[PDB]
């Protein structure tokens, strides 16, 4: 599925990611933007072998089990394909393990490079929630 942006900040909110680990809202939907453009079936290979999944770009050298990355864990206990669903619960739950692993939204890249201190209030702006 590819959401439209408020449509996935209200799926967002409804599961909870709405200031989880005080992230507002406007982040986890900047996050989104950057690393699927918000589709639940993107996924990309990393140099080192493993792949990040979903709308949120989760990898599986720790989170999920794909089958083919060597040396890997999968602390969210779930295969990636789960991931790639139209229905984002395992990607927020999986998603809220990450962001209380440490270095909160930092462990997304494209988070700290494209949405950290930029006014992020304006992905979720217009929209009913
Ligand atoms: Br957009
Ligand atoms: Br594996
Ligand atoms: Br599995
Ligand atoms: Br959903
Ligand atoms: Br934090
Ligand atoms: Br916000
Ligand atoms: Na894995």
Same mark, same amino acid.
């Given at each position: 599925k590819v959401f439209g942006r408020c449509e996935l900040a209200a799926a967002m909110?409804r599961?909870?990611?709405?200031?989880?680990?005080?992230?507002? /809202?406007? #982040?986890?939907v &900047?996050? +989104?933007?950057?690393? @699927?453009?918000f589709?639940?079936?993107?996924?990309?290979?990393?140099?080192?072998?493993?792949?990040?999944?979903?709308?949120?770009?989760?990898?599986?050298?720790?989170?999920?089990?794909?089958?083919?990355?060597?040396?890997?864990?999968? /602390?969210? #206990?779930?295969? &990636?394909? +789960?991931?790639?669903? @139209?229905?984002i619960?395992?990607?927020?739950?999986?998603?809220?393990?990450?962001?209380?692993?440490?270095?909160?939204?930092?462990?997304?890249?494209?988070?700290?490079?494209?949405?950290?201190?930029?006014?992020?209030?304006?992905?979720?702006?217009?929209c009913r929630?």
């Amino acid at each position: 599925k590819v959401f439209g942006r408020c449509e996935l900040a209200a799926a967002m909110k409804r599961h909870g990611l709405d200031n989880y680990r005080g992230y507002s /809202l406007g #982040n986890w939907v &900047c996050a +989104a933007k950057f690393e @699927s453009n918000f589709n639940t079936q993107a996924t990309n290979r990393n140099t080192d072998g493993s792949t990040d999944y979903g709308i949120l770009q989760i990898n599986s050298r720790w989170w999920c089990n794909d089958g083919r990355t060597p040396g890997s864990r999968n /602390l969210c #206990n779930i295969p &990636c394909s +789960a991931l790639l669903s @139209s229905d984002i619960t395992a990607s927020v739950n999986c998603a809220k393990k990450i962001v209380s692993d440490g270095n909160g939204m930092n462990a997304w890249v494209a988070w700290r490079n494209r949405c950290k201190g930029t006014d992020v209030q304006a992905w979720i702006r217009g929209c009913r929630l």
